[PDB]
Amino acid sequence: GFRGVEEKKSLEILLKDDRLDTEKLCTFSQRFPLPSMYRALVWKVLLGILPPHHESHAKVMMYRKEQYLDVLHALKVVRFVSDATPQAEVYLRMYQLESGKLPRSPSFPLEPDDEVFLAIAKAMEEMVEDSVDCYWITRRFVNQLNTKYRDSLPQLPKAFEQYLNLEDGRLLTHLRMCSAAPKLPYDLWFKRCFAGCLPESSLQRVWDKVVSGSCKILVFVAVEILLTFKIKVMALNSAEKITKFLENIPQDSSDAIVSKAIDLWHKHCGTPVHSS
Amino acid sequence: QMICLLCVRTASSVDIEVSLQVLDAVVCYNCLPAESLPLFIVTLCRTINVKELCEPCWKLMRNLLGTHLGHSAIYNMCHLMEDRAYMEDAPLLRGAVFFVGMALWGAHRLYSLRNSPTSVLPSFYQAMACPNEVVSYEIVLSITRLIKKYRKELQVVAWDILLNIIERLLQQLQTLDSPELRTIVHDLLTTVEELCDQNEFHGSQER
């Protein structure tokens, strides 16, 4: 079955309209993966980097590029960044400047928020080719974590504890016998949004859903992580060993991890339905 | 260093008065060593909270800021307001707020200091990182002076930082429940409104 063709053509129809319906684009992003050629466009549109009207994209990208170059040149002028500075750290400093949270000098150690943004920025670099697009996608994504999900993300660990049992109760019982449930890497999974845990070629399938309003996809991604590694987790026998394994999971099974996490999230939270 | 540690450690306050006099001698007729500047500044921020010694302490700080170490001292006092090791040191934060504000927009402004208020107000905001009635009272008094005097001079960026400060003050009033702070914050809002009426307010009226 050529369902990939159906998905791509439906998205091209959603993108053909002179006004892009962000609600339909969100529902599509929930229900299907984004083709890689339209992922940056659709992420820009849902993150509000580009407005719904397609005509306005040229001028708004001029605005975004001007803002990016102005902030970057300013960081160069106050010597906060340099040409050697990694692109992710450049994005971190640009975000700090734009949010008014720039330190006095780059030698000031990173705050936890800074490391979280840096991790998401590193992951974005591999997903988005263009530096301006990558920076804007990164900043809007992290801002969604701090604004659209400031209350939802803290609930995610409990949702993990719930759905983990609901798919294999004995597995969560195995974890709680180790009393390792509060020591699982929730800051990685839900503040850094699996940046640095999954390869970006499949972390992007997660982030399609995170952009389109779903941070529970993160819960199900973690759940499918532990379901995929049942053979290993049921052989794990210590809280610290579990914590270290979960921060460095084998990356080979990650494509299937995210695919089955999306399947699980479509099974437990239902299939998205187009509005009438 | 020895006189500053005296001021920090002394039980007697006349000792602090003559210490401020000796430091005035060091600042005026000699050179304050640039490496003694942070401890000197911390000492004055501590001393400016003693009621009987504010006038000598402010005169000493003004004389120091009249030397070549003035911009360095303003930057150090903003560093004190921003450093996390001093979040709980309320008297020192209050003193730094008082000093930076009095030097840059007080009646005793040093017109030798080239710094716009924009450069130091983020430090005022960070001085309120840990809620403290007296620190916020000094913040709002200093900002009241800055606004009531330099409303025309205050451009949009200065008003951004001032509105962020007023927002953090209004947050604190949900928890400090202090009537003197509440009164001057709401008077400050009323003056900002009057500046909107006179069209001398250049900030974001939306915010």
Partner: peptide, 28 residues
């Protein structure tokens, strides 16, 4: 466009902070 203006406000904020830094660094 207003995001551009806000970015320039922040560039001003850091430039003014840096001018204070540089004056304090230069008058030694």
């Amino acid at each position: 466009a207003e995001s551009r203006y806000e970015a320039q406000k922040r560039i001003t904020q850091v430039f003014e902070l840096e001018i204070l830094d540089l004056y304090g660094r230069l008058e030694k």
